[PDB]
Write an enzyme that holds these catalytic residues in place. Structure first.
Site, PDB file in Angstrom:
ATOM      1  CG  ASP A  81      52.166  15.947 -53.815  1.00 39.13           C
ATOM      2  OD1 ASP A  81      51.018  15.640 -54.223  1.00 39.13           O
ATOM      3  OD2 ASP A  81      53.043  15.099 -53.589  1.00 39.13           O
TER       4      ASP A  81
ATOM      5  CG  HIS B 298      43.416 -10.680 -59.430  1.00 38.21           C
ATOM      6  ND1 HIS B 298      44.091  -9.729 -58.691  1.00 38.21           N
ATOM      7  CD2 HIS B 298      42.124 -10.703 -59.030  1.00 38.21           C
ATOM      8  CE1 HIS B 298      43.199  -9.219 -57.859  1.00 38.21           C
ATOM      9  NE2 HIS B 298      41.999  -9.773 -58.029  1.00 38.21           N
TER      10      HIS B 298
ATOM     11  CG  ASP C  39      49.290  14.464 -57.471  1.00 33.88           C
ATOM     12  OD1 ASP C  39      49.255  14.862 -56.292  1.00 33.88           O
ATOM     13  OD2 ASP C  39      49.173  13.237 -57.777  1.00 33.88           O
TER      14      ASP C  39
ATOM     15  CG  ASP D  33      52.273  13.612 -56.385  1.00 32.04           C
ATOM     16  OD1 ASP D  33      51.425  14.450 -56.107  1.00 32.04           O
ATOM     17  OD2 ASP D  33      52.281  12.488 -55.869  1.00 32.04           O
TER      18      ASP D  33
HETATM   19 MG   LIG Z   1      48.458  13.634 -55.025  1.00 30.41          MG
END
Ligand SMILES: [Mg+2]
Ligand SMILES: [Zn+2]
Ligand SMILES: [Zn+2]
Lengths: 134, 107, 87, 1421
Positions: free
Chosen positions: D475, D1075, D473, D471
């Site tokens: 990185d 779930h 982000d 990513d």
């Molecule tokens: Mg990250």
């Protein structure tokens, strides 16, 4: 701007968008090894066998500190100090290699013991760059 | 082969190896009800003659060790009455080739 | 022992060259070319040792031989010349 | 080292582990370490003649070594010694020293048990070095007397003297670091002196200790006790000497000084005035220090603390993994020529490129040798300097002396010489290893082409975002620079991005078009989407491999307009043929469904994920196999360059408007939730009036909740479905979902319509407070609103109750996530450490570092996973009628021959009896194929992954030869029949002139050939594909050559391959099991369960199939369920009462007055035991009072008098009186034996038995497979042995998830089957696909050693593999301690060993050797 990255308006960045200041404080003391054997803040030089740093000592004044106006860089010596051995051995503080800026404020006081204590703050303006986080 | 109903006394069990070359087998009547060999998952195991084995190790440049092993107590090894050393050839179907043949040496 | 060497007649390994053999012959030859070894191909204006080695390999003018060892230690020596390069 | 050494350069081929004989330590020693001092003796701050001392190595940068006079870089160090005042036990052997004493006579040094014992002969027989010592000890430990005489093998009456004394032996126990015995009024207790233990060991016979785990030359038991302690040279314990005045000695230096101090106290104490019970005090101190130097983290003892309170690093602690020598300094290392920065996405980079920032390229270098080719350019780089970009940092002269171009006074006038090296900057197109940790993939590290760019980030192509897992982000990624013209070749020729495009993990491609490009490609490829010339011309220019030929517009007359499809087809290269059918795809596609590409041009269908993404039949998967990895790598860019350009101008965005659902649809949603809310109330009030009948094997609550959680999910799912369907095609969220760029239905559902029911641990938010979820509610509130249902959307926003409940469930998610990463972490590593050494050898066989066979041909087929695609086996399915129509040729029937329209011979071919013999034998084999395939793939699954895409070969033939489906073929019946027969012979996996290998070849190609005969039958080759002689022979050559490509490559490191191919999909797992059929524990926890080979598993269950002619009958099933479901007396009992009824003929209880009369018509105890049974309990388990009765009757037999009421009597009662002082207490015993002990019906362990109407594909009389749903029983208990022998079941089908059990009952080979099945179902639960071979290998590995070998510290790590190899995981120091004490010899053929020895491992590029033939060399020149 693909995959959690973004494009930034440079004309905005120019105008001062997301621009920040940065400060780092470097600190030192004249340690007392036993009695009357003390360290000394000075601008050292090639005197016998001192293991001096590879940075510019020339930025230091006679007191062994930078004046708070000067631009400091690389491993430029920002605190000049010497420890004696039984002439002088280097105990200087260079700047962080991975950093650069302008000396913002130098503070000369005394430690509770009654010895010379000094703090050096360095300023940098960081501009939003290409790999910067937001 | 002995098909015992519930148990064989440890006194009687002393007599099993007592008479070689003859080999005696102990089988519980209750276990034999279902033929395990018949199960979906149980492939065909084939006992290999001294020659069949020799050839295998020779053809694959193998030591008896290097061969995948089977326990002497293995349900299929008891079924075929595999003795130690005896190699079994196992033929299973494959989802990559049609058939695949593995070999398992006894222990 | 020298029973370790398997003869030319009776050889079982691929008559084709492994992806690893290619990468290693190409590298080995590039490294040798690179340290001023004699070049057996007409380098047609060529200057990169790997490219020169790829030129050497395509023309099959590589003087190396692959000793392919088996799980027991016995080996089959195959030449770069005699190995099919389908890759 | 760094200087020339005359000495020959060899490689470590063997590691001989041994122990130091004190004698060796003295010879090897350069200094007798005498003083616990460091230096400063006679004033001078310089090394003392005691510790450190130049006799060992230099502390200062002196040059002097005083032993080799070599200097710190060169000198390794020299060993010393300390002769110990008394012997000490080596901490690491203390137990083995104890166990050897437990084996031998502590008086004459004789192996306590002789060969005269039969069990001893059995143990002594063991060829294994350690298992022998283990079997010997278990037999010798229980022997407490040394036999002078013993009964002979001949006759036991006349005993034979075996020699040796007759002393009694002590019961040895460990007390800290000492050994204490207990001989035999009152047992004798005395400590065992090291001295004494040593003497006994010295007296142990060579033959005796070699029969124990030991070795005469390298590992004698006596050496396990230390008398001469070797002193490691300074480089093992570096004096980190800072400043002139100060020092700074290492921990180990102190521990040794501590040992030395302790030694001298003892040495003086024993010599001088020895108080003797003070000598044993200073002796125990030296024994402590020497033990605690080697291990400080000792089992229940005080940690030998350093002055500071610090524990003191032991030598054990140093090598103890994750960061110790082995794991942290040898299997892993920090390295030079490496860089790391923040990664940024770039659309203008080619796939296989990597944008390196100028600064980084100016730092990292490459040793180029000065050669006539580069001399000219290299001098200009040297000239350029180390500061200009294409510059150089150092020139290294032949004289091995470095020139620093930054300072050298000659930096400007360096005249290069051939041979010298120029360490120049990394320039554009140098191969480099780019990497994103965690490295759980072959893909996580790939070779890229440098592209020096400005700005501080690593720029990478977006379609390679996926295998790295990157990513942007924040990185960061690693870059490594190869330094050899050989390692550049490694990278470029093996690990480049274009090569990695098609992954062997899933036989599919691991990279595809993503995000902006995926979103934009859907938009571009539409009927509506047309482009004006101005832009068409720019779009064409952007494709770099454009022919310079303007395509003819799809629309000419009104205005020249081009469709997206048309100009995207510019990037799609010629010879690319793709066909795909979705939902209702017709050849005149109505919805722009499916996909059709011919000669690399689009005909119909929108391009999205299924086409241009990382799909199994991908436009990518095809382009690679059909054009090249280099071609495909270009297609990536070209698609992006066009699409991204069009999309830059078309534009794309998302707003709150895209979450806005239309008003009446919101009314409908509100109503769907409202009606589902009332549907819950109805069920809540229903269960409050006890009416609601409980489900089988479930509480009234368990059943009530199931229904509630069902409606509340049905609701969310339906209400969501309304929003999705209401949302326009113009809805930007829908657009991204449609393309498959980002977003799913649930995302739309939770954003626009309804968030839904929140869940913690599978159950809707429970009452954390007394009977309520929050104080904001009343007690005993079971409402949707109280147990956590979120009525609102994310748009409308959550209420405070909704907020907290969502947050509760949300948190459970982050916990699970954090736990799941940890768990998978370990799973990947044990998977990888258990398989390292598995490779494909030049004999196509799969073996390890022992050369032990795992697979006999990799993946049972001998094919490389990468060269496989799913294909269908046409002869498997369909009606026998349709088979006949599609495959039968009969030249003897006027309506069953090939018409002359098909082939030239058609007219003359009719009636040829000799040819019909071919077509008869052809169909007879085709039929044989169908029967076989149905034996293999029992369900009738036709789509299997195989090696040659035959469909595409025929497709490409039709295009290649412009085949006209009108004119008759030039093939003969022999041309086909005999041609396809001859192709089969050239498809070689294994070459070998012998029956074993040839019959193995036949088996490897068995499945592929079925597919061949199926797709190359005479009727098909002539009627379907209208092939010529040319077309067919070409198809054949292509199949042959394409097959030969597809086989595995000897050197293919499939151990790691398989490990990572299970380990990485494991990490992408959500879990545990939804779930909330059965609720079996699945995914990450179930896989942890598998690898550990856990005996007590979380969800053990049996699956019993009914007898053949019983499948439809529910009543037959109901019967078996009743016959296996474990019922106890306890389950039917309301109360157990002990009354006092003294008259057997009269009852104090008026109810029982009727019961006596009758069970007394047609001595006893006065104490009654009355049991009251429940009618409903009896009815759920369909029991009779008599049934129950006879069971109690048969348990106690003739010891308990039993009477009982009838199934009509208002109260169900059983009366029990004892048969024939202190009797009341006896009934309390019998009452527990009744409830707890008695089994009424069904098989034990088999607790809850379920009825399942499972589906089933099975052939019909007509031929075709059909849905034949059968009844099945599921369990909550496991007992195979017994439930198999049960009448009415199918004991040829019965499966258990306890593979441990299936191994025990049906054999290791059938145990393997169950194992793979489970491993597959953990992977397939997450939906994900792993190619057979990967899980097959792990399963095959876990099994070859006849039984279930666990992937643990206990399992594979306790194998006969290398000593260093095994120590590289889990036990380390403990492994290496036994290594010396058993004198192991590491083969050095494991990967690990070479990685530790800094040698080229026999892996891939290292699996073969390279030689120069002087002959062929002189031949070329
Ligand atoms: Mg990250
Ligand atoms: Zn030395
Ligand atoms: Zn004795």
């Amino acid at each position: 701007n693909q995959e959690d990255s973004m494009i930034m308006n440079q004309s905005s960045i120019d105008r001062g968008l997301f621009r920040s200041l940065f400060f780092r404080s470097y600190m030192d003391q004249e340690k007392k090894y036993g009695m009357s054997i003390t360290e000394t803040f000075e601008k050292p030089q090639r005197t016998n066998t001192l293991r001096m740093k590879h940075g510019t000592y020339d930025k230091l004044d006679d007191d062994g500190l930078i004046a708070p106006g000067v631009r400091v860089s690389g491993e430029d010596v920002i605190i000049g100090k010497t420890t004696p051995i039984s002439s002088k051995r280097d105990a200087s503080t260079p700047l962080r290699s991975t950093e650069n800026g302008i000396v913002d404020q130098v503070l000369v006081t005394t430690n509770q013991d009654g010895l010379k204590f000094v703090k050096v703050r360095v300023r940098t303006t960081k501009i939003p760059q290409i790999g910067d986080k937001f | 082969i002995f098909v015992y109903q519930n148990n064989i006394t440890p006194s009687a069990m002393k007599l099993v190896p007592s008479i070689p070359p003859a080999t005696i087998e102990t089988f519980n009547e209750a276990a034999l009800v279902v033929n395990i060999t018949h199960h979906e998952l149980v492939p065909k195991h084939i006992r290999l003659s001294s020659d069949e084995k020799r050839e295998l190790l020779k053809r694959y440049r193998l030591k008896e060790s290097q061969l995948p092993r089977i326990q002497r107590a293995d349900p299929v090894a008891l079924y075929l009455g595999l003795k130690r050393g005896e190699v079994v050839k196992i033929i299973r179907k494959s989802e990559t080739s049609g058939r695949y043949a593995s070999y398992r040496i006894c222990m | 022992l020298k029973e370790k060497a398997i003869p030319k007649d009776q050889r079982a390994t691929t008559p084709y060259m492994t992806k690893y053999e290619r990468a290693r012959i190409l590298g080995t030859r590039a490294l040798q070319i690179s340290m001023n070894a004699p070049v057996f191909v007409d380098l047609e204006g060529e200057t990169d040792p790997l490219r020169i080695a790829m030129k050497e390999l395509a023309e099959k003018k590589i003087p190396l031989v692959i000793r392919r060892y088996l799980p027991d230690g016995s080996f089959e020596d195959w030449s770069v010349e005699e190995l099919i390069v389908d890759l | 080292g760094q200087q020339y050494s005359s000495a020959p350069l060899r490689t470590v081929k063997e590691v001989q582990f041994g122990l130091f004989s004190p004698e060796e330590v003295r010879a090897i020693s350069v200094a007798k370490i005498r003083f616990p001092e460091t230096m400063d003796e006679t004033q001078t701050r310089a090394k003392i003649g005691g510790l450190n001392d130049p006799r060992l190595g230099s502390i200062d940068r002196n040059l002097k070594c005083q032993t080799c006079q070599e200097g710190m870089n060169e000198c390794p160090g020299h060993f010393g010694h300390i002769d110990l005042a008394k012997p000490v036990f080596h901490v690491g052997f203390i137990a083995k020293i104890k166990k050897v004493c437990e084996c031998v006579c502590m008086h004459c040094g004789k192996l306590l048990l002789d060969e005269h014992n039969e069990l001893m002969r059995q143990a002594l027989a063991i060829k294994d070095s350690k298992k022998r010592f283990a079997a010997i000890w278990t037999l010798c430990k229980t022997k407490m007397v040394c036999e002078t005489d013993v009964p002979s093998e001949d006759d036991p009456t006349q005993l034979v003297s075996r020699g040796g004394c007759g002393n009694t032996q002590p019961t040895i126990r460990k007390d800290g670091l000492k050994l204490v015995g207990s001989w035999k009024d009152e047992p004798e207790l005395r400590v065992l002196s090291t001295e004494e233990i040593l003497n006994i060991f010295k007296h142990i016979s060579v033959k005796d200790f070699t029969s124990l785990g030991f070795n005469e030359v390298f590992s004698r038991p006596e050496w396990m006790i230390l008398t001469c302690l070797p002193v490691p040279p300074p480089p093992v314990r570096p004096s980190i000497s800072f400043n002139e005045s100060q020092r700074g000695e290492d921990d180990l230096t102190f521990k040794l000084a501590d040992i030395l101090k302790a030694n001298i106290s003892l040495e003086t104490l024993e010599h001088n005035g020895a108080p003797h019970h003070a000598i044993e005090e200073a002796e125990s101190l030296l024994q402590f220090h020497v033990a605690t130097y080697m291990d400080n983290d000792i089992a229940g003892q005080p940690q030998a603390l350093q002055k500071s309170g610090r524990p003191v690093k032991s030598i054990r602690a140093r090598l103890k993994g994750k960061e110790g020598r082995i794991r942290g300094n040898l299997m892993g290392k920090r390295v030079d020529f490496s860089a790391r920065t923040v990664i940024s996405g770039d659309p203008n980079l080619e796939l296989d490129q990597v944008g390196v920032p100028k600064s980084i390229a100016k730092t990292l270098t490459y040793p180029e040798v000065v050669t006539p080719y580069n001399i000219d350019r290299l001098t200009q780089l040297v000239r350029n300097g180390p500061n200009e970009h294409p510059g150089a940092k150092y020139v290294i002269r032949d004289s091995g002396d470095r020139i620093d171009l930054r300072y050298s006074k000659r930096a400007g006038d360096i005249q290069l010489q051939y041979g010298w090296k120029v360490e120049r900057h990394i320039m554009d197109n140098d191969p480099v290893l780019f990497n994103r940790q965690p490295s759980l993939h072959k893909m996580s590290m790939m070779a890229h082409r440098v592209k020096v760019i400005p700005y501080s980030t690593f720029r990478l192509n977006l379609s390679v975002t996926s295998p790295y897992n990157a990513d942007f982000d924040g990185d960061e990624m690693n870059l490594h620079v190869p330094q050899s013209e050989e390692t550049r070749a490694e990278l470029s020729q093996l690990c480049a991005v274009p090569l990695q495009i098609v992954s062997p993990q899933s036989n599919k491609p691991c990279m595809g078009i993503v995000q902006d490009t995926l979103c934009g490609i859907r938009k571009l490829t539409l009927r509506d989407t047309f482009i004006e010339l101005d832009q068409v011309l720019n779009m064409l220019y952007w494709v770099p491999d454009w022919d310079g030929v303007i395509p003819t517009p799809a629309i000419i007359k009104p205005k020249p307009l081009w469709s997206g499809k048309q100009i995207l087809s510019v990037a799609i290269p010629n010879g690319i043929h793709l066909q795909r059918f979705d939902e209702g795809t017709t050849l005149l596609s109505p919805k722009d469904n499916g996909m059709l590409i011919i000669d690399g041009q689009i005909i119909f269908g929108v391009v999205e994920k299924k086409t241009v993404g990382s799909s199994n039949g991908g436009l990518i998967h095809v382009v690679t196999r059909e054009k090249g990895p280099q071609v495909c790598a270009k297609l990536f860019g070209n698609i992006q360059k066009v699409v991204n350009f069009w999309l830059l101008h078309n534009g794309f965005s998302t707003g709150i408007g895209d979450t806005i659902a239309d008003g009446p649809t919101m009314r409908e949603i509100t109503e769907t939730i409202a009606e589902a809310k009332k549907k819950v109330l109805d069920v809540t009030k229903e269960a409050q009036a006890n009416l609601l009948t409980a489900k089988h094997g479930m509480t009234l609550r368990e059943s009530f909740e199931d229904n509630v959680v069902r409606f509340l999910n049905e609701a969310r799912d339906k209400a969501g479905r309304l929003a999705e369907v209401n949302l326009k095609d113009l809805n930007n969220v829908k657009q991204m979902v449609m393309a498959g760029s980002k977003g799913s239905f649930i995302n739309i559902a939770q954003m626009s319509a309804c968030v839904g029911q929140q869940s913690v641990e599978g159950k809707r938010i429970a009452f954390g407070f007394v009977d309520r979820t929050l104080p904001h509610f009343s007690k005993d509130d079971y409402s949707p609103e109280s147990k956590g249902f979120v009525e609102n959307s994310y748009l409308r926003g959550l209420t405070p109750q909704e907020f907290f409940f969502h947050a509760m469930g949300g948190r459970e998610g982050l916990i699970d996530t954090a736990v799941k990463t940890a768990e998978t972490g370990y799973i990947q590593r044990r998977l990888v450490k258990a398989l390292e050494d598995i490779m494909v050898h030049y004999d196509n066989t799969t073996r390890n570092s022992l050369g032990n066979v795992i697979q006999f041909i990799y993946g049972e087929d001998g094919m490389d996973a990468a060269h496989i695609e799913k294909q269908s086996l046409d002869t498997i399915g369909g009606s026998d009628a349709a088979f006949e129509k599609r495959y039968r040729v009969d030249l003897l029937n006027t309506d069953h021959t090939l018409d002359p329209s098909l082939l030239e011979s058609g007219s003359e071919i009719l009636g040829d009896l000799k040819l019909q013999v071919l077509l008869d034998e052809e169909y007879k084999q085709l039929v044989k194929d169908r029967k076989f395939l149905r034996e293999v793939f029992v369900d009738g699954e036709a789509n299997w992954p195989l090696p040659v895409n035959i469909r595409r070969i025929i497709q490409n033939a039709q295009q290649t030869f412009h085949i006209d489906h009108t004119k008759p073929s030039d093939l003969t019946i022999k041309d086909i029949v005999l041609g396809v027969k001859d192709l089969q012979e050239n498809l070689l996996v294994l070459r070998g002139k012998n029956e074993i290998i040839q019959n193995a070849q036949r088996d490897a190609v068995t499945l592929f050939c079925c597919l061949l005969r199926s797709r190359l039958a005479t009727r098909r080759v002539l009627q379907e594909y209208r092939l010529t002689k040319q077309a067919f022979d070409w198809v054949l050559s292509n199949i042959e050559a394409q097959f030969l490509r597809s086989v595995v490559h000897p050197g293919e490191m499939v151990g790691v391959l398989a490990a990572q191919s299970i380990g990485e999909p494991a990490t992408q797992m959500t879990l545990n099991t939804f779930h909330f059929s059965k609720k079996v524990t699945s995914g990450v926890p179930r896989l942890k369960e598998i690898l550990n080979v856990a005996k007590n598993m979380k969800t053990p269950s049996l699956t019993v199939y009914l007898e053949p002619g019983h499948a439809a009958d529910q009543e037959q099933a109901k019967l078996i369920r009743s016959a296996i479901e474990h019922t106890t007396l306890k389950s039917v009992t309301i109360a157990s009462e002990i009354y006092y009824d003294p008259d057997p003929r009269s009852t104090v209880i008026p109810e029982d007055e009727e019961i006596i009369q009758l069970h007394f018509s047609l001595q006893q105890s006065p104490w009654l035991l009355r049991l009251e049974l429940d009618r409903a309990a009896m009815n759920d388990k369909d029991l009779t009072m008599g049934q129950v009765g006879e069971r109690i009757k048969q348990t106690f037999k003739n010891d308990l008098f039993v009477i009982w009421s009838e199934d009509n009597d208002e109260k169900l009662i059983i009366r029990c009186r004892v048969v024939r002082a202190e009797e009341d207490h006896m009934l309390k015993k019998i009452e527990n034996t009744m409830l707890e002990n008695i089994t009424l019906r069904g098989v034990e362990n088999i607790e809850r038995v379920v009825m399942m109407k499972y589906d089933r594909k099975v052939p019909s009389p007509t031929g075709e497979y059909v849905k034949e749903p059968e009844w099945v029983l599921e369990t909550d208990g496991v007992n195979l042995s017994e439930v198999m022998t049960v009448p009415g079941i199918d004991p040829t089908r019965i499966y258990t998830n306890s593979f441990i059990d299936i191994m025990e009952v049906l054999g290791i080979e059938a145990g393997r089957a169950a194992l793979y099945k489970e491993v597959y179902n953990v992977i397939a639960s997450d939906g994900s696909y792993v190619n057979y071979r990967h899980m097959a290998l792990l399963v095959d590995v876990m099994t070859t050693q006849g039984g279930l070998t666990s992937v643990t510290r206990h399992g594979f790590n306790r194998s006969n593999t290398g000593a260093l190899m095994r120590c590289s995981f889990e036990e380390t120091v403990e492994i290496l301690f036994e290594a010396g004490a058993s004198a192991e010899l590491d083969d050095c053929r494991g990967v690990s060993e070479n990685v530790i020895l800094g040698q080229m491992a026999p892996i891939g590029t290292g699996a073969f050797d390279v030689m120069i033939d002087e002959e062929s060399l002189v031949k070329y020149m």
